[PDB]
Design a protein that fits this description.
Chain lengths: 515, 139, 315
RNA sequence: GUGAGAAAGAUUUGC
RNA sequence: AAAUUUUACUCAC
């Protein structure tokens, strides 16, 4: 049915592939590809372009963002039980906390400042040294990245050490800054469609457009290329340590450690490789493994191929193609004049995950589709009504609801089928505000968030420290007594007000209610 | 023994960032195991029951959007709408009124939304989310 | 204050260690020839190769579950329960369980399923798959069809597993009109019983798809759909246009979603003026990438859809 | 069902 | 038995 569309269609309406296959096969395949590329028989991993164009950032103060060093996402933490390395799957928050406990540092910035200012690799930083940190930071765990549309065989992703993440944060921040300085396309605040529009403007002069993908992108980006880029932008010893850890990385597949001296393990340094391409020439507009360029004659095309080869961006003969009236970048398809190509495009369907999350996500998807002109508004209204009916048919049963209030949606035992326009204009019952894409979170979302907080990897016995005064800086240090006092004061004030728990706050509702 | 000394062994003071990160229960992830989780123990059913009689009768009534202008289909462009965050005094007052501190802190920061729009008006004014085709204006 | 470009006292030693470590060798420069994108003949060749290599099943095993069987609710429940009893499924706590001891550790036979005439019960089938794999062991009924999800558990003697966990697979059993080798009879009731072995992620992925919304969104701006035969060939005389719905149902049942890869490559084909020689064609060969009857059929019918588009509405 | 331990348990699965 | 190294763990309450 995707084949009989008048316009462009990627077939994104259904969900991506998934399965319970173990990640061992994919990780082994990736490692073998990296080894073969290292041998110098399949693709090119030797960088020959000139990066002297890139500005040096070696004099910038070493700034660390603590917010992005703590997360609920997974990571690998290395311990030594008796005499062997054991890799544990934890959350980035727990891994960073364990790192700071071992090193005995207040914050990650203090830890990096201490690491950079030691007399020798054997000098102790708490209960560890820089040598031990480097040895532990080369260990990776393998998992499977599923639901990637168009990849029936799932790829392998890798969880890294907290120290590796700490160094990569600085490196990638500075690489992103250099990219933003190199061109206006790489600005921090830019959407995919905006980037595609800029690309369309930048390639208008020439006749033919080469829409290219890079094959084996991660396997062909060597530690040498990363070190070259980092020295070009002036990353100091941080870049050297990162390159050393990357060259000596090991992956735990099932129950065995496999050494992978080539590649960068599935998009650890996207910005650095983008720089590896961008600092040698200005004829490309690349975003990791996807790029677009323009040319007029076969000589220019051969020059393009030479530039791609010299920067270790091996062309994908399977997917890369040449067009004259089309422009594909960031999955966004545009005409040569920058207007959106007619058709569904990347429009993605909304699966059934919760009675109200499905409706909210459908409303967001339809708002995006109608704003960009993918479909007219009446079609979106019909589709929203159809989705409400489907959700009613799936969820209106005693398992999920025992209510019969009229204002409720039909999927929760009610009798209200809200119009899409009525929902978008906030002309509805307050219960429907959560279904608005800009409205509060839904009941399902809160329930699932709490249950996730209760999981084995994320469960903790610590007294929660939430509902904090906005004036308190999150960089302030606190003790157990301090958190106890803060919680007691907040609880006392809330009880005095008469509220058992804090009232949820919504920016849009608050602003609208104001006079 | 206290949990502070167990989770932060060897350290007596930690940043509020780390401590808050250790207890996070407001991050939602869209996953395949959603209906199963919602059915388990009738958690969604109980949550709906609780919302209908504890959380619903506290939401202020929001006025509906009225102003709209004539629009015509045009070339794809980017609409930049800058929404400023709460001022300091506003945040203090909202906190003293019993509102969630984390949400107020998140609303402190000014932000800008970049959205692709394929509709334009005579005076080139911004539009609300999903209502560019109808002409509802931010004003 | 420390700066990012700060040079540590151990910089030289780490640089020397990096120097002593292995380095990559320059690779071979590829030769790229740009040609026109593939024509109808190449897609026909790919379809013929799939057909020759794998062949066809005598019946549409689980796709046939998309059409109503000729039994009422009570008859469907009785047939399913008696089939479960006939297969020696353990009965415990009012629910069915399938026990396994030894595995051949070889892939199941793969062929291409013929297309049923239509799939009126697609929404109901997907909802039932979701519900049954969420709560398994007993027959679940819809307005027009029934399903039975049976946990597949190891047999270990006395302390063998009693309750399924998050990693336990399910055998989904459905009913369709008789007339194939999977016929089953009991007390004058006849039905073809077809099974599908799914891991929990697979069943969750299958059950969460919205058939009706997807069909409407596709229908928004699509061209006229031609009638097709049981094998996905253009047949303007004896073909049916409802089989397209069946194809959509197949794409919903295939948890590998190879049709999405075919769709992306076909989009590249339609937007391309010139492609690489002998390499763009290989993007349509995805048999090595998938494994199983349902994924194979989905790939075959995606290629058939591309062929039909190139035939009836050439671009 | 709850807690802990297996390179490990479902927010799994990273940038 | 099947979409076949997957459908498997232990302890205590
Ligand atoms: Mg591309
Ligand atoms: Zn049969």
């Amino acid at each position: 049915m995707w084949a009989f569309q008048e316009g462009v269609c990627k077939g994104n309406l259904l969900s991506g592939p998934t399965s319970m296959k173990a990640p061992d096969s994919a990780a082994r395949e990736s490692i073998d590809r990296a080894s073969e590329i290292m041998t110098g028989k399949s693709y090119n991993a030797v960088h020959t372009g000139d990066l002297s164009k890139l500005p040096n950032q070696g004099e910038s103060p070493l700034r660390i963002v603590d917010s992005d060093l703590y997360s609920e996402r997974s990571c690998c933490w290395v311990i030594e039980k008796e005499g062997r390395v054991v890799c544990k799957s934890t959350t980035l928050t727990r891994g960073m906390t364990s790192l700071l406990n071992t090193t005995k540092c207040s914050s990650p910035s203090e830890l990096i400042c201490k690491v950079l200012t030691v007399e020798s690799l054997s000098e102790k930083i708490g209960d560890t040294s820089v040598e031990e940190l480097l040895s532990h930071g080369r260990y990776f765990k393998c998992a499977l990245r599923d639901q990637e549309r168009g990849k029936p065989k799932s790829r392998a992703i890798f969880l890294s050490h907290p120290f590796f993440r700490l160094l990569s944060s600085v490196v990638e921040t500075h690489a992103r800054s250099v990219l933003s300085k190199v061109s206006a396309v790489y600005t921090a605040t830019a959407s995919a469609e905006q980037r595609a529009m800029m690309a369309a403007q930048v390639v208008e002069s020439r006749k033919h457009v080469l829409n290219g993908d890079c094959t084996k992108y991660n396997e062909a980006i060597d530690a040498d290329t990363l070190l070259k880029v980092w020295d070009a932008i002036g990353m100091g010893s941080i870049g050297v340590m990162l390159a050393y850890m990357v060259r000596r990385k090991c992956v735990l597949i099932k129950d065995t450690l496999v050494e992978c001296p080539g590649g960068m393990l599935m998009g650890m340094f996207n910005a650095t490789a983008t720089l590896a391409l961008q600092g040698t020439t200005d004829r490309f507009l690349s975003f990791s493994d996807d790029f677009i360029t323009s040319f007029n004659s076969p000589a220019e095309l051969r020059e393009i191929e030479d530039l791609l080869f010299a920067s270790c961006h091996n062309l994908s003969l399977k997917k890369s193609y040449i067009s004259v009236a089309s422009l594909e970048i960031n999955s966004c398809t545009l005409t040569r004049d920058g207007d959106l190509a007619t058709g569904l495009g990347c429009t993605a369907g909304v699966p059934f995950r919760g009675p109200l999350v499905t409706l909210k996500q459908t409303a967001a998807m339809l708002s995006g589709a109608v704003d960009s002109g993918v479909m007219p508004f009446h079609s979106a209204e019909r589709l929203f009504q159809i989705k409400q009916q489907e959700c009613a048919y799936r969820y209106n049963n005693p398992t999920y609801t025992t209510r019969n209030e009229d204002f409720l949606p039909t999927c929760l035992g009610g009798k209200t089928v809200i119009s899409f326009q009525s929902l978008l204009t906030w002309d509805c019952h307050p219960f429907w505000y959560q279904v608005h894409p800009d409205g509060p979170d839904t009941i399902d979302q809160k329930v699932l968030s709490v249950l996730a907080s209760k999981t084995r990897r994320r469960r903790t016995r610590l007294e929660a420290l939430s509902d904090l005064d906005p004036l308190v800086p999150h960089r302030l240090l606190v003790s157990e007594s301090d958190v106890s006092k803060i919680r007691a004061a907040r609880q006392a004030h809330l009880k005095s007000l008469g509220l058992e728990q804090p009232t949820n706050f919504n920016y849009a509702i608050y602003k609208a209610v104001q006079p | 023994m206290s949990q502070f000394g167990k989770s932060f062994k060897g350290r007596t003071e930690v940043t509020i960032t780390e401590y808050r990160s250790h207890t996070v229960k407001d991050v939602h992830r869209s996953l395949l195991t959603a209906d199963k989780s919602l059915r388990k123990s009738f958690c969604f059913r109980n949550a709906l029951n609780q919302f209908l009689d504890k959380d619903l009768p506290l939401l202020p009534i929001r006025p509906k959007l009225e102003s709209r202008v004539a629009v015509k289909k045009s070339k794809l462009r980017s609409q930049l709408s800058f929404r400023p965050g709460l001022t300091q005094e506003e945040a203090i007052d909202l906190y003293n009124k019993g509102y969630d501190g984390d949400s107020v802190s998140g609303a402190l920061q000014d932000r800008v939304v970049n959205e692709p729009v394929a509709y334009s008006s005579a005076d080139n004014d911004k539009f609300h989310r999903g209502l560019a085709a109808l002409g509802y204006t931010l004003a | 204050v420390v700066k990012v470009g700060h040079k540590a006292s151990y910089d030289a030693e780490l640089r020397e260690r990096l120097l002593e470590l292995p380095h990559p060798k320059s690779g071979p420069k590829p030769r790229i020839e740009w040609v026109a994108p593939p024509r109808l003949a190449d897609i026909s060749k790919e379809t013929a190769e799939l057909k020759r290599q794998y062949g066809f099943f005598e019946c549409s095993k689980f796709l046939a579950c998309g059409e109503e069987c000729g039994l009422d609710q009570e008859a469907r429940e009785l047939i399913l329960n008696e089939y479960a009893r006939d297969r020696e499924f353990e009965f415990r706590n009012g629910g069915w369980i399938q026990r396994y001891t030894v595995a051949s550790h070889k892939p199941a036979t793969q062929k291409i399923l013929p297309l049923p005439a239509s799939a009126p019960l697609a929404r109901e089938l997907l909802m039932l798959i979701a519900r049954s794999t969420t709560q398994a062991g007993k027959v679940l009924h819809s307005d027009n069809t029934s399903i039975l999800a049976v946990p597949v558990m190891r047999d270990s003697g006395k302390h063998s597993k009693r309750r399924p966990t998050a990693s336990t697979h399910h055998l989904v059993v459905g009913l369709s009109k008789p007339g194939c080798e999977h016929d089953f009879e009991f007390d004058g009731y006849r039905a073809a019983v077809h099974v599908m072995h799914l891991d929990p992620k697979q069943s969750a992925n299958i059950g969460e798809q919205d058939f009706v919304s997807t069909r409407e969104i596709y229908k928004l701006d699509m061209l006229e759909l031609p009638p097709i035969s049981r094998k996905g060939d253009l047949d303007r005389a004896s073909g049916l246009e409802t089989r397209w719905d069946v194809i959509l149902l197949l794409e919903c049942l295939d948890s590998t979603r190879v049709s999405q890869a075919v769709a992306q490559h076909f989009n590249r084909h339609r937007l391309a003026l010139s492609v690489c020689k002998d390499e763009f064609r290989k993007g349509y060969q995805l048999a090595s990438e998938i494994r199983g009857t349902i994924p194979l059929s989905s790939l075959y019918y995606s290629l058939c859809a591309v062929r039909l588009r190139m035939t009836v509405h050439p671009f």
